[PDB]
Ligand binder design. Sequence first.
Ligand SMILES: COc1cc(Nc2ncc(F)c(Nc3ccc4c(n3)N(COP(=O)(O)O)C(=O)C(C)(C)O4)n2)cc(OC)c1OC
Length: 127
Amino acid sequence: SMNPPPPETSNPNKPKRQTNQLQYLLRVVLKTLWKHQFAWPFQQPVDAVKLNLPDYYKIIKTPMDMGTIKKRLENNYYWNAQECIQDFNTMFTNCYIYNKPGDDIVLMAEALEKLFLQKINELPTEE
Ligand SMILES: COc1cc(Nc2ncc(F)c(Nc3ccc4c(n3)N(COP(=O)(O)O)C(=O)C(C)(C)O4)n2)cc(OC)c1OC
């Protein structure tokens, strides 16, 4: 049993730029979620080998995690905020698909998502 390669966090062929929205996503949104007490299961790719979840990457074919998102932001991998927002949504959705509703990990994800949505409502206008 093996893990897939993690999602890419840089690509020399993918155009990049900075925007105040992407800055906010790193400095406020990611930062808030990253330091939250429920962040830890989401701070790196799911290690299915270690967790003995041999079915994880059979069920989840679009993995995503905040470690990857953090590196993507730091590496200026994204062109726009919606790409980053999509990654957070993929991360939450994977949890809700793989785990049973009501499991603690689902409650942790829901708490993080609630907080995420609050911060996204406060996204600044593009400069
Ligand atoms: C409920 O299923 C999920 C569980 C998690 N849990 C989850 N997410 C992230 C973790 F870091 C983590 N730590 C963890 C959890 C269980 C563990 C171990 N570590 N280690 C320690 O590894 P290290 O030696 O310290 O490196 C082990 O050695 C064994 C004994 C194999 O059991 N668990 C995380 C999930 O999604 C993000 C899950 O949904 C897929």
